[PDB]
Structure 1
Amino acid sequence: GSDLGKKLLEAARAGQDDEVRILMANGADVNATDASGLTPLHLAATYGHLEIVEVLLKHGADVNAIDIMGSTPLHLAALIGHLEIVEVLLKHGADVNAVDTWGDTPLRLAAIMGHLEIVEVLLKHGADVNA
């Protein structure tokens, strides 16, 4: 039979907000992970799907879920450059100073990418310049 968690990951990545809600109401685990540890929240945060990020969080998504590389959804939003998603993640308790496998924080990632508005937001939320 079909895997609801795999469908939830695909709906979160595709930006299908109606399907995300339906899947979860029918038993899809909000914290379903693929082979690399990516959750629906990691995918919605990467693809810039703000409403899906908010829906996932309201349904109990782990805001600080880490994949095999230690990337939290905040790392992914800061790297790509989704400002409103960074702000929503921080509001829901994202670890501003989370360090991935390469020793990078969301602040480092936003800085190297030249995402200055995100840099300022992270710093205002307690990003440690020495982490």
Structure 2
Amino acid sequence: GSDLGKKLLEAARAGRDDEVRILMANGADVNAADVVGWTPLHLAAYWGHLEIVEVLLKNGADVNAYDTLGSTPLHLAAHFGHLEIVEVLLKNGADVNAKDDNGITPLHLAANRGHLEIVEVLLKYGADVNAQDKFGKTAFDISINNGNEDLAEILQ
């Protein structure tokens, strides 16, 4: 962990586009990670900062970087309903079937929070609809348990 690495983590989180720009020019470590294993891309994905997700990927950020529990930026973006960031991550080669330590995928998380637009995008980029978590649950099992009629019909 470097001085500019810490500055980039804080800037990526806060959504300060202009500060990230200056930090990219000075070569702030894009693979900088905090104690839980979150990169600037993780943080930008979580808090929904589209411009910074794009700028970090341009500057050779790991699109499939995983935290200490095996969660990727696509997991975060899919879970918190950031449609534009999900599309960008998938276009820059994000593993659509990425499994965390619980066996949970972006499709599982999106299904759980009922993000219909995101579920369609994930399925479009070839998300495994039959993918089971550690409890043997699919995105379909989540849709019927949540009682989401629209979602259950799409996961046919």
Correspondence for 2:90: 90
- Mapped partners of 1:42, 1:16: distance in 2: 15
SS of alignment partner, residue 56 of structure 1? helix
> 2:125 aligned with 1:108, yes or no?
no
Unaligned runs of 5+ in 2: 132-156
> 2:146 aligned with 1:124, yes or no?
no
The one-letter code sitting in structure 1 at the alignment partner of 2:17 is D
> 2:81 aligned with 1:71, yes or no?
no
- Mapped partners of 2:90, 2:126: distance in 1: 10
TM-score (norm 1): 0.96
SS of alignment partner, residue 128 of structure 1? coil
Q: Give the Å deviation of 1:21.
A: 1.5
Q: Give the Å deviation of 1:130.
A: 2.0
- Mapped partners of 1:70, 1:12: distance in 2: 20
TM-score (norm 2): 0.81
Correspondence for 1:51: 51
What is the RMSD of the two structures over their aligned residues, measured on CA atoms? 1.0
Aligned length, in residue pairs:
130
Unaligned runs of 5+ in 1: none
The one-letter code sitting in structure 1 at the alignment partner of 2:118 is I
Which stretches of structure 1, 4 residues or longer, exceed 6 Å deviation after superposition?
Answer: none
Larger Rg over CA atoms:
2
Q: Give the Å deviation of 1:24.
A: 2.3
Q: Deviations over 1:74-125 (max 9, x none)?
A: 0000000100000000000000000011110000000011111100110011
Identify which of structures 1 and 2 has the higher relative contact order when contacts are C-alpha pairs closer than 8 Å and 6+ apart: 1
SS of alignment partner, residue 107 of structure 1? helix
The one-letter code sitting in structure 1 at the alignment partner of 2:29 is D
Q: Give the Å deviation of 1:56.
A: 0.2
The one-letter code sitting in structure 1 at the alignment partner of 2:109 is L
Q: Give the Å deviation of 1:27.
A: 2.7
The one-letter code sitting in structure 1 at the alignment partner of 2:8 is L
Q: Give the Å deviation of 1:14.
A: 0.4
